[PDB]
Design an enzyme around this catalytic site. Structure first.
Site, PDB file in Angstrom:
ATOM      1  CG  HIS A 172       7.156  -2.503 -26.021  1.00  0.00           C
ATOM      2  ND1 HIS A 172       7.223  -3.682 -26.735  1.00  0.00           N
ATOM      3  CD2 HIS A 172       6.001  -2.543 -25.320  1.00  0.00           C
ATOM      4  CE1 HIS A 172       6.155  -4.408 -26.477  1.00  0.00           C
ATOM      5  NE2 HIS A 172       5.398  -3.738 -25.617  1.00  0.00           N
ATOM      6  CG  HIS A 175       0.902  -5.091  -8.586  1.00  0.00           C
ATOM      7  ND1 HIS A 175       1.997  -4.265  -8.444  1.00  0.00           N
ATOM      8  CD2 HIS A 175       0.624  -5.568  -7.352  1.00  0.00           C
ATOM      9  CE1 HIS A 175       2.341  -4.213  -7.168  1.00  0.00           C
ATOM     10  NE2 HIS A 175       1.523  -4.995  -6.483  1.00  0.00           N
ATOM     11  CG  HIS A 210       2.316  -5.838 -21.036  1.00  0.00           C
ATOM     12  ND1 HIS A 210       1.406  -6.171 -22.020  1.00  0.00           N
ATOM     13  CD2 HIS A 210       3.428  -5.413 -21.681  1.00  0.00           C
ATOM     14  CE1 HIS A 210       1.943  -5.968 -23.211  1.00  0.00           C
ATOM     15  NE2 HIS A 210       3.169  -5.500 -23.031  1.00  0.00           N
ATOM     16  CG  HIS A 253       5.107  -1.151  -8.885  1.00  0.00           C
ATOM     17  ND1 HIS A 253       3.739  -1.316  -8.851  1.00  0.00           N
ATOM     18  CD2 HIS A 253       5.393  -0.243  -7.921  1.00  0.00           C
ATOM     19  CE1 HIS A 253       3.222  -0.556  -7.899  1.00  0.00           C
ATOM     20  NE2 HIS A 253       4.203   0.109  -7.323  1.00  0.00           N
ATOM     21  CG  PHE A 276       6.403  -6.452  -9.623  1.00  0.00           C
ATOM     22  CD1 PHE A 276       6.538  -7.781  -9.175  1.00  0.00           C
ATOM     23  CD2 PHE A 276       5.186  -5.795  -9.393  1.00  0.00           C
ATOM     24  CE1 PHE A 276       5.476  -8.448  -8.537  1.00  0.00           C
ATOM     25  CE2 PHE A 276       4.126  -6.434  -8.771  1.00  0.00           C
ATOM     26  CZ  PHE A 276       4.265  -7.781  -8.333  1.00  0.00           C
ATOM     27  CG  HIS A 316       6.725  -7.513 -23.808  1.00  0.00           C
ATOM     28  ND1 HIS A 316       7.410  -6.535 -24.500  1.00  0.00           N
ATOM     29  CD2 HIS A 316       6.327  -6.944 -22.643  1.00  0.00           C
ATOM     30  CE1 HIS A 316       7.454  -5.430 -23.775  1.00  0.00           C
ATOM     31  NE2 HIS A 316       6.804  -5.650 -22.644  1.00  0.00           N
ATOM     32  CG  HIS A 369       5.548   2.224 -23.621  1.00  0.00           C
ATOM     33  ND1 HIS A 369       6.459   1.469 -22.906  1.00  0.00           N
ATOM     34  CD2 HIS A 369       4.501   1.404 -23.877  1.00  0.00           C
ATOM     35  CE1 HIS A 369       5.984   0.246 -22.747  1.00  0.00           C
ATOM     36  NE2 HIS A 369       4.789   0.182 -23.319  1.00  0.00           N
ATOM     37  CG  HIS A 403       1.738  -1.965 -24.775  1.00  0.00           C
ATOM     38  ND1 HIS A 403       2.231  -1.837 -23.488  1.00  0.00           N
ATOM     39  CD2 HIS A 403       0.640  -2.760 -24.689  1.00  0.00           C
ATOM     40  CE1 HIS A 403       1.488  -2.573 -22.677  1.00  0.00           C
ATOM     41  NE2 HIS A 403       0.518  -3.138 -23.379  1.00  0.00           N
ATOM     42  CG  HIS A 459       6.693  -5.594 -17.476  1.00  0.00           C
ATOM     43  ND1 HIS A 459       6.084  -4.374 -17.239  1.00  0.00           N
ATOM     44  CD2 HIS A 459       6.791  -5.717 -18.827  1.00  0.00           C
ATOM     45  CE1 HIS A 459       5.818  -3.793 -18.398  1.00  0.00           C
ATOM     46  NE2 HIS A 459       6.263  -4.575 -19.376  1.00  0.00           N
ATOM     47  CB  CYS A 460       4.119  -4.834 -12.462  1.00  0.00           C
ATOM     48  SG  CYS A 460       3.059  -3.548 -11.852  1.00  0.00           S
ATOM     49  CG  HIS A 461       2.498  -1.456 -18.379  1.00  0.00           C
ATOM     50  ND1 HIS A 461       2.863  -0.128 -18.447  1.00  0.00           N
ATOM     51  CD2 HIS A 461       2.703  -1.971 -19.611  1.00  0.00           C
ATOM     52  CE1 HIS A 461       3.253   0.153 -19.675  1.00  0.00           C
ATOM     53  NE2 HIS A 461       3.154  -0.947 -20.403  1.00  0.00           N
ATOM     54  CB  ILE A 462       2.911   0.145 -11.722  1.00  0.00           C
ATOM     55  CG1 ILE A 462       1.387  -0.008 -11.759  1.00  0.00           C
ATOM     56  CG2 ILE A 462       3.340   1.323 -10.852  1.00  0.00           C
ATOM     57  CD1 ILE A 462       0.728  -0.077 -10.443  1.00  0.00           C
ATOM     58  CG  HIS A 502       9.941  -1.729 -22.450  1.00  0.00           C
ATOM     59  ND1 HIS A 502      10.500  -2.301 -21.315  1.00  0.00           N
ATOM     60  CD2 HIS A 502       8.699  -2.264 -22.566  1.00  0.00           C
ATOM     61  CE1 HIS A 502       9.632  -3.146 -20.782  1.00  0.00           C
ATOM     62  NE2 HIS A 502       8.538  -3.153 -21.530  1.00  0.00           N
TER      63      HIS A 502
HETATM   64 CU    CU Z   1       2.828  -2.926  -9.815  1.00  0.00          CU
HETATM   65 CU    CU Z   2       4.120  -4.591 -24.251  1.00  0.00          CU
HETATM   66 CU    CU Z   3       4.045  -1.845 -22.401  1.00  0.00          CU
HETATM   67 CU    CU Z   4       6.257  -3.947 -21.479  1.00  0.00          CU
END
Ligand code: CU
Ligand code: CU
Ligand code: CU
Ligand code: CU
Ligand SMILES: *[C@@H]1O[C@H](CO)[C@@H](O[C@@H]2O[C@H](CO)[C@@H](O)[C@H](O)[C@H]2NC(C)=O)[C@H](O)[C@H]1NC(C)=O
Length: 496
Positions: free
Chosen positions: A64, A394, A397, A455, A460, A399, A109, A66, A449-452, A111
């Site tokens: 991805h 949390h 993010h 998670h 998530f 897209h 990163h 980002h 989604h949560c970027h942890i 994905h």
């Molecule tokens: Cu989270």
């Molecule tokens: Cu992204």
């Molecule tokens: Cu990302």
């Molecule tokens: Cu993402």
């Protein structure tokens, strides 16, 4: 640096970024992953050659970019099973896209599952030859990119489902508590020169309070959005966020500590953990002996604005949009939940489903995770913090979009007049009600989604199915994308 047109060869290898070594993920033979650059307007052609052999860290991959909108190239977005099947090992796949209308600090990163934590993550910079903050600094190069990363001695699938970092990495390097000897990153500055530093959080989990002994930082960018300059003292940066800050090297020639205090694992800084070194030219080759001062002036999100002072889409009142959505966080099994539904990756990627003729959020798999969005509409999303979802704050993010942050964590004020815009936002903690807005410019399925990462792995996430009826016309896919799935589905489960 590399790009915009480049091979990205992905492989497995041993690395030792905190002085201990383990099997990780290499990019063009190096860890951490190499910086990619281009200019506002460039076509990026990143041909991603997957040579991984290691099933524990996953043989397949998917990448991805980002921050980039990917208008018309939703197929190149990256999320595994939303936007493609993963690239299969022994195969290549070309992400061919443009960035008109964007410039700033970005990163890439994996994905796919939680593989970015095993090391497939690096920074991207798109320069504006007309940058409105340009005359604030002298230096803006590969040396001025500063990455923060959490690091684990056990790989993501080998240790806990939610582990704790052994080290923080700054430009790839840093120390764990068992490795007080390990090398430190060194950022070199000349006295009287002015620098644009680009801070990228490559983190799978912790946020970091970042600060440089003896110096102040003039923030000019958030997640690739130009800001009115805002001077600070410390920046609490969340996983996946970026800031540009200008540093004026106008202090006593010397060595000063650069600090990134995580919110978990090893807190405080004994032995130069969570640390790197700002070094003026002419200063002795030694570790800094400076002190942090509690200091005031931290970055406060609700106080930033876009350089252009752009308004929130919609009208200045709660619900003043075409569609208002509320995301209720929860945690049922050992799985995160948004409005009662937990994201599990579908066999057929969400984009392919749409392309194969699914027409609505209700035909889309997974059931309860996809939200249909109408074309050319003002959308409002609220994501009220709750301890019902463990491991808050949390950072959510979206897209395919930058959004106005109408209400930041820790504030009660709503700002429709001139909010900060960004792509990753902290949803804060009990009693916060982070609220965001964007316009539905951009047809295609977009992960939110949560970027942890851990998670995300535990579900998530939702999918903004944007303007479903125009997806196929707006995103013609290339031959190679069509072949990803047949190739991936043909694999044995341990070549995955
Ligand atoms: Cu989270
Ligand atoms: Cu992204
Ligand atoms: Cu990302
Ligand atoms: Cu993402
Ligand atoms: C491929 O991937 C993993 C993780 O990178 C490796 O797992 C290691 O193996 C042994 C168990 O055999 C452990 O004692 C380690 O703690 C593991 N390291 C990782 C970082 O957790 C593994 O060896 C790899 N396989 C190939 C053969 O190198």
């Amino acid at each position: 640096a590399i790009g915009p047109v480049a091979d990205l060869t992905i492989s497995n290898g041993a690395v030792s970024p905190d002085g201990f070594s383990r099997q990780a993920i290499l990019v063009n033979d190096v860890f951490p992953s190499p910086l990619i650059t281009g200019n506002k307007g460039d076509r990026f052609q990143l041909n991603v050659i997957d040579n991984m052999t290691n099933h524990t860290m996953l043989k397949s991959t998917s990448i991805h970019w980002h921050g980039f909108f990917q208008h018309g190239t939703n197929w190149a977005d990256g999320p595994a099973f939303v936007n493609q099947c993963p690239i299969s090992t022994g195969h290549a796949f070309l992400y061919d896209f443009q960035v008109p209308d964007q410039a700033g600090t970005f990163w890439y990163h994996s994905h796919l599952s939680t593989q970015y934590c095993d090391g497939l993550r690096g920074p991207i910079v798109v320069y504006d030859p007309q940058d409105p903050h340009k005359s604030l600094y002298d230096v803006d190069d590969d040396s001025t990119v500063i990455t923060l990363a959490d690091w684990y001695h056990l790989a993501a699938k080998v240790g806990s489902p939610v582990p704790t970092a052994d080290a923080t990495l700054i430009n790839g390097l840093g120390r764990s508590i068992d490795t007080l000897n390990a090398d430190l990153a060194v950022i070199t500055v000349t006295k009287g020169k002015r620098y644009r530093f680009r801070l990228v959080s490559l983190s799978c989990d912790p946020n970091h309070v970042f600060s440089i002994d003896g110096h102040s930082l003039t923030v000019i960018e958030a997640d690739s959005v130009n800001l009115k300059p805002q001077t600070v003292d410390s920046i609490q940066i969340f996983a996946a966020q970026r800031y540009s800050f200008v540093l004026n090297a106008d202090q006593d020639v010397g060595n000063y500590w650069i600090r990134a205090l995580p919110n978990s694992g090893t807190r405080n800084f004994d032995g130069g953990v969570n640390s790197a070194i700002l070094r003026y030219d002419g200063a002795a080759p030694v570790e800094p002996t400076t002190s942090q001062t509690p200091s005031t002036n931290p970055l406060v999100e609700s106080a930033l604005t876009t350089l252009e002072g752009t308004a929130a889409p919609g009208s200045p009142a709660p619900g003043g949009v075409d569609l208002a959505l509320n995301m209720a966080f929860g945690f049922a099994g050992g799985k995160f939940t948004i409005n009662g539904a937990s994201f599990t990756p579908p066999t057929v990627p969400v984009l392919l489903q749409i392309l194969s003729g699914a027409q609505s959020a209700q035909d889309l798999l997974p059931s309860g995770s996809v939200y249909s969005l109408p074309a050319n509409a003002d959308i409002e999303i609220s994501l009220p913090a709750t301890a019902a979802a463990p491991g808050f704050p949390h950072p959510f993010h979206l897209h395919g979009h930058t959004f106005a942050v109408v209400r930041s964590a820790g504030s009660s004020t709503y700002n429709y007049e001139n909010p900060v815009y960004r792509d990753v936002v902290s949803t804060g903690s009990p009693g916060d009600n982070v609220t965001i807005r964007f316009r539905t410019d951009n047809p295609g399925p977009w992960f939110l989604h949560c970027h942890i990462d851990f998670h995300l792995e535990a579900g998530f996430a939702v999918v903004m199915a944007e303007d479903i009826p125009e997806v196929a016309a707006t995103n013609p896919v290339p031959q190679a994308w069509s072949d990803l799935c047949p190739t991936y589905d043909a694999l044995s489960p341990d070549d995955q």
